[PDB]
Structure 1
Amino acid sequence: SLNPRDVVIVDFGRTPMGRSKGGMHRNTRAEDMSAHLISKVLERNSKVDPGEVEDVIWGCVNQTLEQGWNIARMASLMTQIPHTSAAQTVSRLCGSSMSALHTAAQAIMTGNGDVFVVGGVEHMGHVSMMHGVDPNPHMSLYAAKASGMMGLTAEMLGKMHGISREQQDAFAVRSHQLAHKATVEGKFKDEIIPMQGYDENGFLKIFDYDETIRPDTTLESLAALKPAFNPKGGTVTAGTSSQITDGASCMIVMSAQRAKDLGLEPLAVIRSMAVAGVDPAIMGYGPVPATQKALKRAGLNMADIDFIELNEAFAAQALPVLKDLKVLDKMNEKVNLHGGAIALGHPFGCSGARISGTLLNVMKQNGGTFGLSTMCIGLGQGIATVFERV
């Protein structure tokens, strides 16, 4: 049965994940990339009047230059979306895009809108991360500055749970391998929205795959890389770390009521939402707290979840999270079956809805019922979402 104010994810569409170091998006603005996605996704669903969109919630982190000044509205104005709608940009570092989904979800539930357009974007090519950073010395008075370096935290959380260089590299291979497969088999054809770009020759052409993926990634090739955050005794290498990727992800959301009226079959339904905090030093541990809080709110045990999408920030962090969540021995059976941020890249403001969207496609394709999408956040945070197929 349906409850009028139940949150329903109607559709999901992401952009082809392209490299930042001269990738396929090196000549496209984050605003346009987002505007085009939102526009195209709305087309596939001609039954949802763009005018009904009460608000467009977009996730973005480095909000300056191209991504500054509420990119949500800036990207929404170049869409068929009326000027009568609103738009806000939600930043929570890594989990920005997911928090966006939560904001709309809560709005719908409380009767403050019927149709929403959530998602996120992050063009780390035009707006790099280290760009425009001013470390506040005062922070060292309440927390270690080193905790600001995601890499070092991966090293710390890694040592604690004891993950060997081999264990991490092996994970990266699994990610690339599973990503390529999903791509070749067409398990991405529905979510990836073809998008214009430029090849290494400046030529114009449409890409519908993820440049980031590297099928040739073997344990041999990975064991050749050097420690990225700790030369003298490190395991976290560029190979086991997520990729710097420019990309956007969209998601149309609305109430089951206004949905049932439009007679459009749901893709999934949000059951529980959760956000939690951890110490900055081991921020990668954010998922477990956030997940446990979500499971309790959804009245479900970790075992009840059929498929899981854990944003692969670092193999050194993903593995520990999976171990404490007590599902490491279930990995190849229900965890990131299409690869992770290591092969698909990790666009800060985009990864939130991206992993969740992919999660749904996994469930739909594998007849799953309950799904879980969670990710670690910088400076000690976590976020989780439990969807349901009905």
Structure 2
Amino acid sequence: RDAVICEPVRTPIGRYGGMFRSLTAVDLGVTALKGLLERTGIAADQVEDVILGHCYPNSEAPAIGRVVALDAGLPITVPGMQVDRRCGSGLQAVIQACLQVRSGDHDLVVAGGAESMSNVAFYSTDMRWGGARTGVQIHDGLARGRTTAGGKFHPVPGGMLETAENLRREYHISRTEQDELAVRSHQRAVAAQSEGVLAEEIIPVPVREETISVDEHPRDTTVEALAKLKPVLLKQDPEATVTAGNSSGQNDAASMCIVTTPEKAAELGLKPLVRLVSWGSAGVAPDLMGIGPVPATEVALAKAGLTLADIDLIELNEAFAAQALAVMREWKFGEADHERTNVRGSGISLGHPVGATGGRMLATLARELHRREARYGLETMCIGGGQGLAAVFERVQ
């Protein structure tokens, strides 16, 4: 039996240190979850699991899906969990949920993600047994993660950014093209804001006293202003092109959806948007992580009996413009194809709040697939440490 997605939602996405800084990852999750149930009218006891992608957990919220369910006020009956496959964790939660559903184990579950990058921890592995002989190192969680993902044999001191630079180098990607992609990202996000489509996606968030519905970071952005910015690794390398302007930031948000059967959705009065056709996962070289989408997509299209040409709409994460352009090069893109890809924006304009990112992409794909009455959508992303995840979704009718 099929697995279908209903009411995929998100909060607004805040900047690191910005709008949502007073809010925990849990507060955002709850807000997204309350909104999901509130829009749906679903009885709390209908939810059989809450599965949440969450990339920077600590003991403030163990097994974060369960904490988020309780905090949202669902009954003690409702189980929950946390998953991490990096930048792909949101999609992963979704995939797990569909698997749990299709099997016939569960009829309805929640799949989501939450990240508060603003409030990620600083930690020490030196204070337990003492620093009397070694000193004390305290690591920023965001910063350390950037270099450790590849493990011991594939270190990257320059982190995520260094991977993109490698890509720009390997594909001869001009700075201009990169800045250009970014503009589109902003124009599209902004266009979406004012065309009213975004309200469909968003649960507004109350901050102790006002309520927020608009994503903080999308902006007036021109190729000319972007040309001005100084790349991060210019001193390390003089041919750098990656800047804050052409790359996604660090952000706060949550994403929620319902994963259910068509039969169950009909009973609960729900309106399913897509069903999951297939998915694929891949490993790639960690220093080349930005390319993980290509092998993963290939696997997914094959499982689907599908071709990329067959595909109506694409959500490809814009971790770095350079990274995205490289996948698009491999996909042999034509100026039209940029029509069907990232239509409402992406990481660069929106933000990249890592756990919630897969959800955001889904909310946009599925809903947009509806608005267009289009058949197939692709969701795919690169993963820090050398991974890729992709999923194929089909509109319901």
Q: TM-score, normalised by structure 1?
A: 0.92
Q: Which residue number corresponds to residue 106 of structure 1?
A: 99
Secondary structure class of the residue paired with 1:37: helix
- For residues 340-388 of structure 1, give each alpha carbon's deviation from its aligned partner in whole angstroms, at most 9, with x where no partner exists: 1000000011101111111112211122111111010001000011111
Shift of residue 52, structure 1, vs aligned partner: 2.0
Residues 291-306 of structure 1: pairs in structure 2 closer than 5 A: 291-306=297-312
In 1, Cα distance between equivalents of 2:370 and 2:386: 32
Q: Which residue number corresponds to residue 28 of structure 2?
A: 33
In 1, Cα distance between equivalents of 2:283 and 2:92: 14
Amino acid at match of 1:42: L
- Which residue, out of 210, 213, 217, partners 1:212? 217
Residues 219-298 of structure 1: pairs in structure 2 closer than 5 A: 219-231=223-235, 232-298=238-304
In 2, Cα distance between equivalents of 1:65 and 1:150: 26
Kindly tell me: are residues 27 and 236 of structure 1, through their superposed partners in 2, closer, same or farther at Cα, counting changes over 3 Å?
Answer: same
Secondary structure class of the residue paired with 1:35: helix
Amino acid at match of 1:100: A
Q: Matched residue pairs, number?
A: 375
Q: Single out whichever of 374-383 and 28-37 deviates more from structure 2.
A: 28-37
Secondary structure class of the residue paired with 1:383: strand
Kindly tell me: are residues 128 and 239 of structure 1, through their superposed partners in 2, closer, same or farther at Cα, counting changes over 3 Å?
Answer: farther
Contact 1:18–1:246, Cα closer than 8 Å, also in 2: yes
Shift of residue 55, structure 1, vs aligned partner: 0.6
Root-mean-square deviation (Å): 1.9
The answer to whether residue 21 in structure 2 is matched with residue 62 in structure 1 is: no
In 1, Cα distance between equivalents of 2:3 and 2:75: 23
Amino acid at match of 2:221: T
Q: Which residue number corresponds to residue 327 of structure 2?
A: 321
The answer to whether residue 174 in structure 2 is matched with residue 164 in structure 1 is: yes
Contact 2:150–2:385, Cα closer than 8 Å, also in 1: no
Secondary structure class of the residue paired with 2:117: coil
Identical pairs, percent: 44
Amino acid at match of 1:316: A
Residues 324-339 of structure 1: pairs in structure 2 closer than 5 A: 324-339=330-345
In 1, Cα distance between equivalents of 2:110 and 2:195: 29
Q: Which residue number corresponds to residue 136 of structure 2?
A: none
Contact 1:19–1:246, Cα closer than 8 Å, also in 2: yes
Gapped regions of structure 2 (runs ≥ 5):
123-138
Contact 2:150–2:286, Cα closer than 8 Å, also in 1: no
In 1, Cα distance between equivalents of 2:6 and 2:150: 45
Kindly tell me: are residues 188 and 99 of structure 1, through their superposed partners in 2, closer, same or farther at Cα, counting changes over 3 Å?
Answer: same
Shift of residue 53, structure 1, vs aligned partner: 1.2
Amino acid at match of 2:14: G
- For residues 45-65 of structure 1, give each alpha carbon's deviation from its aligned partner in whole angstroms, at most 9, with x where no partner exists: 11x322121110001011125
Amino acid at match of 2:48: E
- Which residue, out of 5, 10, 34, partners 1:9? 5
Contact 2:52–2:82, Cα closer than 8 Å, also in 1: yes
In 2, Cα distance between equivalents of 1:136 and 1:334: 35
- For residues 56-97 of structure 1, give each alpha carbon's deviation from its aligned partner in whole angstroms, at most 9, with x where no partner exists: 00010111254x411211111112322111101010110011
Q: Which residue number corresponds to residue 37 of structure 2?
A: 42
Q: Which residue number corresponds to residue 372 of structure 1?
A: 378
Kindly tell me: are residues 160 and 147 of structure 1, through their superposed partners in 2, closer, same or farther at Cα, counting changes over 3 Å?
Answer: farther
Residues 115-154 of structure 1: pairs in structure 2 closer than 5 A: 115-127=108-120, 131-132=140-141, 133=144, 139-140=151-152, 142-143=153-154, 145-146=155-156, 149-154=159-164
User: Which 4+ runs in 1 deviate beyond 6 A?
Assistant: 134-138
- For residues 248-294 of structure 1, give each alpha carbon's deviation from its aligned partner in whole angstroms, at most 9, with x where no partner exists: 11111112222233343311111101111111010000111111111
In 1, Cα distance between equivalents of 2:212 and 2:268: 32
In 1, Cα distance between equivalents of 2:32 and 2:319: 24
